[PDB]
């Protein structure tokens, strides 16, 4: 596995490491595209552990999770980090399935199969939360508070991923900063990456910063005035 | 193999560089405005295979995931998923790991994980979707072409002379003017095409416009005659 | 196939013929029992083409349409006219299935089977619409505006189908005309057909014109006053 | 084989000619008023086989379509579909091509199309249905028979003397008077039957009427004693 | 089969016996735990007849009832008493399935199997109703009006089932009587049975009379004042 | 094999006699207050096998009914069904004949009826359920233990000294005070445990309390700093 590029905003990586070894289930909280998913993949490799990602949604059922085997069960048998992305989207009654894996009992009853699986001692559930869950689900997790990084830091992230000089990346950040009166950092990476293809700066921002997020016209010409301030 | 497409703006070059960065694109705009044909033109201009998916609700994970979306990932082909919003959401999130820096779709159950070809790109069409999904895309905004260009397209697609096409656009122009004033959506370019070809076959122009431009988009009688008023002035 | 009796009210039959040969999908719009279904069957035989009828409803799914093969697919392979009656009743997300058959692309992706079918060059979709659909579905169709025919004409239709003299048929029409302050022409055919069995004229109308349509009592004795005007 | 039926109106002759024209009939009216028994009497009087279908929601297309509805089409038998409104709607529309001038049900999947026998007729029962379906039927309106006739039926069905039957109808009469004033629906003839036969077996008439005429139709206590007041006057 | 202990409150047992032999379907109406289910089992054995109980619920379907064979069908073939407990809870469209068994026609169409079953001449449907059904379902049944028995009688029932002296049972009844400003008689049996285990009288009532029924705090200290009146 | 449990009240003796009468018990109270561990302690103290069921919605009749609930009936073991309300209702009513005087579960389809062992007991957990089901149970009301006892539990479970545990409880005390004033539910004992063990591993106590006591239960910022104020006073 190649190492995923994650730039630490604060002390979130040792808090996770501490939390991981300490048996406790982790919850990541923040807006869209603030590096939550990437953080997991960075910790998954840094701790030298397998990674299984689950894109949760409103139509996902329990048997999609445990099997008919399923991702959650596989993640339980082999020592893997099970990342339930977008936990809010999923039906909240399909998530109580993970409850036998989150407290001191660490097993998964596949009562359709008549089997009680072992939880590989190196197993942990991490979930993504933006920005509702049950209290019997919330209060079984430790929580990290993620957010869009400091302007200097985000500018470093954009330049590294999109492939543009600092001066352009700072402008993308300053535009984005005022744009969130959330707006994914990935959209800034897209914008810069387009500029790295000889695309008009405003057009690059129009494609990524004003069009994918809102279909309100007078919205756009409020964000396309702030793009014209810097670019 | 160039499919007929007339650019209204910088969409051809913007999508070009948009593909050069392998960025997931979203085509936004009204129905029948050239979105589905724009992809074909770019798939030809960028010189690469194209796989089209018509998204409905009875489209499970399996059929999207031997799977067409999986095929475009192997070959390195532009994957155009038309009308994504209609598809149930356990599909919309299937494309999520293909929108990451990873470039990878998980062929679970069946076996291995699939790392996509460097020439692969995912394209969707859009007028719901979550902000988690919308912000994974770059976006181009399509609207009905200006009278000059639109008439050229109609004339070419309908097989009618320039004069007839201009009048058809003129009718469509007077009808798009009425959105929020009686129409849920202005007149499509597709219906403009539909009209000229009835005319190109000898059908009375007033009748041809009635069954393609007036009737399909309106049930209200007093504003349907308003469109009929327009037709009787240009034809 | 025996020819279905269709009496032309105006220029709807050459407009369909013109529209058919011209690749465009047709939509029939009008009240219940104004001869929409019959018109299709008349055009189906007159153009010497196979006919597949689909009774759309709120519980009909896409796999009921394309197959698990289905009617729509069969209609696509062999050169047939696929008539989707009562298109408003069906779930509007199950109808976007026909979209790949209605524009210039003319195919049907059976992604459950891994097959892309050819559209037999003599294939067309016609739908029944009373009196909502998506704009992405509406604006792919040409539309004919059907309605209950002129009094003289409907009287001819009733006499031909029910089997009664003109004088009785005119009365059924005049009653119906004022009854629609819709009311199917078929109910008039039923009424006359009962009169052709030695049934009291008012009783024949009571069974067909006032009872099947409304369960409001004071409604009935408003329609049973107009039946007593003519009969 | 004549099943016991007493005509309240011209329903027997109206249905007779209604069948002679092979017209789809609908029986409208309250529950337990003789609708399901009227069909049997006519199926006997018109001298023809009869197939009855009890429509619920777990009645797919297959079970209606070797299928009973298909059987009546082959043989030429009156097909009585009881409580149509309860059935899911992909069934209600199965009968549509059998209500046309065609007289034909499509046995799709399995094979051929099925042209029905000239002696076939479809009958439904009704107190929802679309106007597209309701206007495919002729309709007869059933209501509870007038005191003279109703008592004769009760006496015959219950096996009680004329005097007892009249009082039971009298109780039912005073209860149908209260609809919109405390009762969702008046007292059925079926419950009137139920009462006499408890009485025909030696059960105290006040108790017999209580568990058949009062209790099954009312939960409200102060109007339940209102019905109990009626019972204690005739019994 | 051992005889179930049922104490007759009034003339409900001969009315059932009379109703049973007289072909008519029976309905039991009353609050929770007033001896409705027990009454059926008492009549089932006293009439020397097999008994099949069905716990109706909002997710129960028709095929759960008739088979895929099912309980209702089995109860129809062999001469058994089919007891549909909690009929209000079930989907009311899944219960019209029993309609062909409740009138003079006594059959069950398994149209999925292509079979019309005989109704064993000794077959009857009894249902539990607390305290809505369709009129086409209601008016096919005879109805018995059950209720919590007279204080003297209920005290006899508690002493017999729980195993406590009269004086304790009367107190449980008097507490319960005022508690229903329903409250199951079974909760009184539980309370006394706990007292028969050396449990504090108020604690025994707290576990059964104030805690299982309400989660309102100021409710509890209104019922725990009346428990302190007698105990 | 005694699992660590500290009694807050008479729950151990009340459940003891509650089992001696073979009465179905319900454990009521907030999440993470020791309900699931109380059963284990009693299953050990009463000297008998224990089968635990985690109830979700995709738990049909079959998996509850070779079935664990059936197993506890044969063996004579306490059957703890955790979070019953989450389970679909055709399961909640499966336990109904096991709550009667009969003591019997019907293994239908598969065959015979199953009479349970005299040592069998059914236990559920609860904070919906019908009154028909709730009144089939005896009930014990659990709440978070008083500061003395709670700190002892935290200290034991967290592996921290008495002083640290008391402060953690103090923080939890100041947070349970805020329910109805900004919090949907007070701080669990489980999160109190979670905090001490980060501290028992060298994590900064202010950070440890932040990610276990503050962050998991609050999204509102101005009252999240209110909890942060509390943390900065005790740590
Ligand atoms: N430390 C970081 N903070 C913020 N964004 C980052 C960081 N490191 C990488 N990114 C970029 O953010 C983009 C989106 O992050 P993502 O994993 O989608 O966040 P989320 O899971 O919260 O949506 C990635 O493409 C990545 O390049
Ligand atoms: N450059 C163009 N701009 C607009 N419309 C065009 C252009 N070229 C062709 N068309 C016509 O406009 C119609 C647009 O419909 P299509 O692109 O197939 O679906 P949609 O636009 O809804 O994705 C086509 O029928 C086509 O004949
Ligand atoms: N030209 C016509 N106009 C109106 N009604 C007609 C015509 N020709 C036949 N009919 C009669 O109308 C009846 C109902 O027509 P139908 O096909 O049900 O219309 P729809 O499909 O709009 O409900 C048929 O039984 C037919 O006999
Ligand atoms: N001519 C009649 N009119 C009214 N009721 C009758 C007549 N003949 C018999 N009955 C009795 O009335 C009851 C009507 O119920 P039934 O006809 O079976 O169901 P429904 O009337 O709801 O279709 C029957 O139980 C029958 O005993
Ligand atoms: N005659 C009676 N009246 C009231 N309760 C009784 C009677 N006989 C027994 N019981 C007790 O009532 C308890 C609950 O009765 P149950 O069958 O649950 O009533 P329901 O079916 O109305 O809920 C039983 O445990 C039984 O011991
Ligand atoms: N006697 C006790 N009272 C309260 N909490 C306890 C006790 N003993 C242990 N605990 C701790 O409290 C937590 C309670 O969670 P648990 O009992 O497993 O779930 P729940 O209480 O939600 O059923 C456990 O993690 C356990 O470490």
Numbering used by the authors:
A (entry chain A), C (entry chain A), E (entry chain A): 11 to 78, 90 to 152, 160 to 209, 218 to 267
B (entry chain B), D (entry chain B), F (entry chain B): 12 to 76, 90 to 151, 160 to 267
What does the paper say about this structure?
Another member of the expanded α-carboxysome locus is CbbQ, a member of the AAA+ superfamily proteins (ATPases Associated with diverse cellular Activities), which are found across all kingdoms of life and fulfill a variety of functions, mostly involved in ATP-driven dissociation, unfolding and remodeling of macromolecules. Here we report the characterization of the CbbQ ortholog that is associated with the α-carboxysome locus of H. nea (Hneap_0905). We have determined the structure of CsoCbbQ, a AAA+ ATPase protein in its hexameric, nucleotide-bound form and show that it is an active ATPase. Our results implicate CsoCbbQ as a component of the assembled carboxysome, where it is tightly associated with the shell.
